[PDB]
Design a protein around this ligand. Sequence first.
Ligand SMILES: [Mg+2]
Lengths: 51, 51
Amino acid sequence: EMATKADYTLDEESRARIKTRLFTIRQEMASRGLWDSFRQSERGEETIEER
Amino acid sequence: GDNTKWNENQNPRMFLAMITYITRNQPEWFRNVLSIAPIMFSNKMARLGKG
RNA sequence: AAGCGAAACGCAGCAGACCAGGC
Ligand SMILES: [Mg+2]
């Protein structure tokens, strides 16, 4: 985690909880083999006009 | 001078023809949305009224 | 001058032989 002026505004327990959640999400996603797809980003394609 | 029976003689099919000619080269959705009105008016039914 | 509905995202090498060829 990185915070402006190195001021995270929160106690270490709250940030540790949020990081844990993020990790849990990471492992849950990796278990289904979708992490590599998510890795690549910059998704921006649209075509729908009017039908 | 005015034109006698103006509304009684302006056929909606003529407006459909004019809309189709005006909307030449335009996107098909634009032609459809513009031409729907004359189509419905050509099939219009007049309610007789109070009685 | 004009005027209308007045979030989040640019790889990588063997190396060392031996042969043929170039001016
Ligand atoms: Mg030479």
